[PDB]
Subunit: 149 residues, 12 copies
Amino acid sequence: RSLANAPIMILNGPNLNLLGQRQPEIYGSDTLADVEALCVKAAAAHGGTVDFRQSNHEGELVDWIHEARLNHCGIVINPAAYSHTSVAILDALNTCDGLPVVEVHISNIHQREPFRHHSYVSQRADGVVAGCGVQGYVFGVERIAALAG
Amino acid sequence: RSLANAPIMILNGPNLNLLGQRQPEIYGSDTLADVEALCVKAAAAHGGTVDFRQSNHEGELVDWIHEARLNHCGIVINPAAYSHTSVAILDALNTCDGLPVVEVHISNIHQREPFRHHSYVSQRADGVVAGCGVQGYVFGVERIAALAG
Amino acid sequence: RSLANAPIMILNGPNLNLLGQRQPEIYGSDTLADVEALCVKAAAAHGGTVDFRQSNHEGELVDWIHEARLNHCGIVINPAAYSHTSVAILDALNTCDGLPVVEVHISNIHQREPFRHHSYVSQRADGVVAGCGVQGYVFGVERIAALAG
Amino acid sequence: RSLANAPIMILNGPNLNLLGQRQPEIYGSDTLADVEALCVKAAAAHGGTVDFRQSNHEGELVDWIHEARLNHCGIVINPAAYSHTSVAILDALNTCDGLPVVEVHISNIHQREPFRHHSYVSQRADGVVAGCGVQGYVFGVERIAALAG
Amino acid sequence: RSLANAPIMILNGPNLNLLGQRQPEIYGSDTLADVEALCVKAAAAHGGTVDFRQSNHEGELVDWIHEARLNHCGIVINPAAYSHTSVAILDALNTCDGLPVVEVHISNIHQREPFRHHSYVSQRADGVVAGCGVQGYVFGVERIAALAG
Amino acid sequence: RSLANAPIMILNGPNLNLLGQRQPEIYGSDTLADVEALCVKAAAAHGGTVDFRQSNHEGELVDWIHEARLNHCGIVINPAAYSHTSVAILDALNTCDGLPVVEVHISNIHQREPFRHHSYVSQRADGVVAGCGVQGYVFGVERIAALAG
Amino acid sequence: RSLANAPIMILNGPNLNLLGQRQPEIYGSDTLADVEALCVKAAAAHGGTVDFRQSNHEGELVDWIHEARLNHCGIVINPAAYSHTSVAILDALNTCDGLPVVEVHISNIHQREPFRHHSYVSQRADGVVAGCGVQGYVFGVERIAALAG
Amino acid sequence: RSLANAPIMILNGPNLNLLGQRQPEIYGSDTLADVEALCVKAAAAHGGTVDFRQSNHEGELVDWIHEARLNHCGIVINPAAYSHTSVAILDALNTCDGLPVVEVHISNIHQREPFRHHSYVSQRADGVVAGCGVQGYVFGVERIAALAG
Amino acid sequence: RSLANAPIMILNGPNLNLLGQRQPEIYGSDTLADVEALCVKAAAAHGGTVDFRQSNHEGELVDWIHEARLNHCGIVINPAAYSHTSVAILDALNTCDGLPVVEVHISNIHQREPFRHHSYVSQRADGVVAGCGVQGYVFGVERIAALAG
Amino acid sequence: RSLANAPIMILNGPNLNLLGQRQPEIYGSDTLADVEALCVKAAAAHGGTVDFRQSNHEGELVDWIHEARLNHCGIVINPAAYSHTSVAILDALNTCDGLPVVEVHISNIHQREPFRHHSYVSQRADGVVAGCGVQGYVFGVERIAALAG
Amino acid sequence: RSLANAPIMILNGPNLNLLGQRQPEIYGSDTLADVEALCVKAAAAHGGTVDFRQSNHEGELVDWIHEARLNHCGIVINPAAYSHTSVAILDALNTCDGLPVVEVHISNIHQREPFRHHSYVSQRADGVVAGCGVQGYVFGVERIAALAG
Amino acid sequence: RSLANAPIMILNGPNLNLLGQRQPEIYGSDTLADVEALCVKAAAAHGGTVDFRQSNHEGELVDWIHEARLNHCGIVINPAAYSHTSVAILDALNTCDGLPVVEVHISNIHQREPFRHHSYVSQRADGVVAGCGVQGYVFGVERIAALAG
């Protein structure tokens, strides 16, 4: 499946629904909607499309990964807190044999608490982008573009 | 948001629906309905109300936290098993800037298995009560009362 | 409750819906439906029945465990990835006093990554069967048969 | 020994003599004297009395626990630093067969340095209250009132 | 080699010679002889035979594994204590290229002491059966019968 | 201070002089020359220039870090093996107060050996990009442009 | 200093004054007064005397060690909880160059909680006796007699 | 079986056949024949006898424990190296229900390499004596005497 | 408080009263009195005085720390064994807001046993001087004079 | 003992009987017989002899080490699996005062499973050769020749 | 050999060249030139001289240590980052038999990140001075002066 | 490349320049010039040559490793302290596809401090020789001869 043939799946994990609605001062101002638009743009430039979703539920993300698996040209995923706990998410991505996956984190997890330093997703992800702000999602889109074609 | 303005959210994690229905001998005789009533009563003494919920799903508890964040004056939470596994509930509670939070554990988790000794929730909670029985929910209510007022 | 009174609950964790639809070469060719057929046949030989289910959601697995506790004669469970992460599913199983429970892994988890070597379910499970293929579910049913009678 | 029969021992560890005399801004303003009053008041509501003490010496706290054993209806203890270091006081409490014991920490030790995360006293404490401020000693007295009657 | 061509080697580690004879007198408990009789019948159901042995000596077990490598159709092994200490027994099993191996533990080693949670045999064994009682041996014979044919 | 004022330092650690001259089959085909060219172009798009350097010496990398501190508008660094051992390069970066740093790894270090899972530089870098191939350098550059402007 | 010259110092750490006054059923019936009398008799058999003491205070124990060092022919110590926490007692014992020291525990600490498995006193003690009951204190005396002569 | 009924088995582990034959200067001068004579003497005094044995084989020590289990009044054991590696001898000792057992080490193993600090035998042994020299075996005989009567 | 206003408190932990009285060969010849003289002279060179004390009691060292906090210009402390165990002395020193504190060890603790490598005092002390012999006390006083003025 | 006075003992641990008989492709083709011949030739060149043995039994290797201590000029040992498990072999080599000992491993243990990275034998062995194939035994004999000469 | 014969070598590891040029507010104002001046002064007072150097290169530091070994009377060293990572610098100091060495840290490393708590140099250094500011360099020169004379 | 075609590179890490110049009594008398001779000598017997180099600088060893990769027929390397610390020397060796590498340590590193137990270079080296003295470099030259031809 190519970029032209199918969309890029963009998945966002728990609490990301509240992006840019917390402390517009300490946290950014961009919202999940601003982020999605960043993706549409980025994908468009390469003649591609995206399919942008967010969920707080472990199992629902598993379901979307299976859908991606059969119907999408790659996955850009920010597992958010499930990055550090979900073997389930990791196993679902392991079934996507041959599919480009890029993992993205808005903040530099490596500067945070020690329990965030490890990500189950990072053993399957082809690339991992961390602490590049919302710009990481564009980087994620571009990397899929390159890999997918 | 005050105790008179809005209710206190009392969230209950997995398996607590079966409270008191196991071995009325080794475990208590009190039910989730008994706990709810202990909470309604303790809050009425301070002129407030509660909104009492239980779920076995992590993401649903996350959703309820986001709810509380905009609509309630505090959170009493017994995360049960998710206490030890849920970075997602911790992140959820972290979006509740300025909102009092008290963690309650019926049993004394420090006397149980080592995996029970750590809670992700305790690093955000203002207070943690453990091993005081269902009475610890009344404590949790009293504390929310003092912080909110 | 006997094998003649109530069915055996067989529960399957995340990702098992894709069983046998991956790399029919590296991975087997039996589907979840094949497995369910195998369990019905083994139960029938003992004059019993099975109730066969699968879910990607941790909370839904817990609910099904609560049900079994009141309506089934035993549990055969492949927690998949949740074996390694879910304290919740263990505490659910822990309410099943006196009920037989056998944990089954299709692959030998002890030959894979160190994080799969530990299962929370194995401390409640009466028996644990790993790396015996889909045949391990038949062994599960026979064990339940023997414990239930 | 009942609440109407004998006093509640309230024991306070090292450095607590300086409670509220440090930085009235970052630390509270309540003193060990204000806490005793809170304690006396809570216990009078249930028709009981308190015996309130404080010492910097491990051995002296061990001496006071042996006394409680013969003269008191229960123990509310804030071991302070000795929580993390004193097997001696754990062992002293262990000789108090069937005596209600509640452990209190004014601050939420779970948010402090890792060495403060474990307490030897918690494995004997019937309950543990941390992070509830000086109000925690109130909860302590209440819990003892419920256990002792 | 087929079951028709050669027996299944059933190896029993140290202390198993005392199976079922610990005091006082629990009626109807199985002895090592009982297990041998169960094994003979299980293999006969599939047209096969068994060569059932037991040893207290690490080195003899190794010798018997070398024997099986050339004369037997598969191995069922209850290494007992040696499961946790014998790299030598694993290294012997590793010389048995292609040969089927199933490790059997009568008790659920995962509910006992932490040192018994790891088995060296388990990294070679094709399948591991724990805490299915003496019935686990019959599961071990059935698995060999399926891998052999 | 800015992209138009001063160049971007791009620093390459040890063994990167051999980029693309190894097994043009298992490893890429692009050379450091190519990468440098990728960087020049990305920079030019934003009207900036790069100052691309490589070295096998820990101290030389420190020296170079101090130079960027006074004469460059940001740093992109791939410290290669020194990511996991070099506290001195971390401390050098730490002197570069307010200067944007981005760490690039060609390969996904989280999929490799455990000793490569930690990087000292990661606790100073604003962002970290791993496993996106040479393309990550370009990301590094694009991010420096954004932080710089 | 010989056995005929000076007494054997017998020292007893915290909580041991309560020996035999707990659960005459689960714990022994023997009191510290019974122990002292066994020590006197043993030491007499060898023409020696004893100086038997108990304290709940770390520092007083260090004081008596310093006394023994100059006035006694040996030390039998049961340090109780201080075995596991007291570097100070170990340092005190360290200044007693050439002096025979025997450590005694009534119960088999190796069968208890993991934190009682380690003893600071044991790297200095010539002999360690554990789980031999109060008779162990007689073993202690006899070893001193043999070491002093 | 009493002391007047049956002998005390005294088992000796590997390499002890060379006791006192090494560096009569840095190691003692007593031999295994001298230790045997001490034990016969100590036992006779209480009207008992001993069966004194040494082997370098793990398996033979397990055989002998099985023999003691039925024919002897208790076990004094110095497992030497096998103290630190043998689950099999621990498990043998575990079958000897109600049989008194004392562990003896000549040297104080707690002053040697960390790997000698843990003994598998210590979790079953009623008493452990260490670094009391050959006299420890006399201590062991005396402990059995008191335990058998 | 200035050096001209109040004395420097010089506190010495357990076993230091025996300084120089041990092996005048392996250990020095300087006594605690000699050390006190050295401290008077160092303070005097800066116009100041010292208040020199030693105790084998944890809780007394705390009392004296509380005393210094209100009556002295600084602390020089050789905690001895309590450096490795005393969270209480650490907490006492933490109440000394803005008071200069220096920690002194006569021997280089980093060359001794691993339990001696960590000091609780060092996380509060402004400086730590180790292995500089009794001269280290002089350095201590000189540092307090510099920080005090 | 020189090389002219006594043979060099070459000892081979468990499973080495099967040397060269497994997968002549993945494993070598050399057998234990080929190795002995390499060893006889190397010893002759230096005017000595060898005494070449192989056993699967820990305690026999122990017996043979005792023998060598009296009868041989040195020991060249390939402990195979017992390298990682036998404190008993180590204790045997330790009684061999003044005797040269070289440890040999055909494969480079440092590149296999982590439990293979440690050898109890390496802490007594004068030298350790690994990963140099059967040629490593030649080095072994050469090193003994240089030490015994 | 002596302070009069030869200079004191003073070495400074990486990034120390920037000393006092960072944030004159959070960090001191003294430069490496100011430190060299304090050292000269302090040595002159004892009729000695100093040879003050700084390097970012591990290997150059080793070369200077070799030099001092034959041409200097002692070493005062602030290894900076290399303290925590340089086995090579430790090994070079270890060649300097009988030569006095004092390690000095400007900040109290014990209060920073856990990877800074350990120094390879402290196992060789006779004394270690930390968190005494640039004054720690003066203490070092004094210690050297006392040790050299 | 062959032994006839190209030299064997023999690389020596830090501090080995002082080999035989320390304590001729505790350390050998052999110098790096003597080791070099033993290398030339061993290579000549097989018709080959050597290129013998020593450096204190990590990055210089890495440069030399690149050099060997294109011009030499193998590497024998004694990385000295960098064995334990240098991931960059490891990575250099990994670029040398198909080239025989042997690590040599003069001393038996397994008998010294724990930090010396692990070598990064051992995971790439074909063979590792330790504690065989300077003779080890001879074994290393021969192994290179055997693998190169």
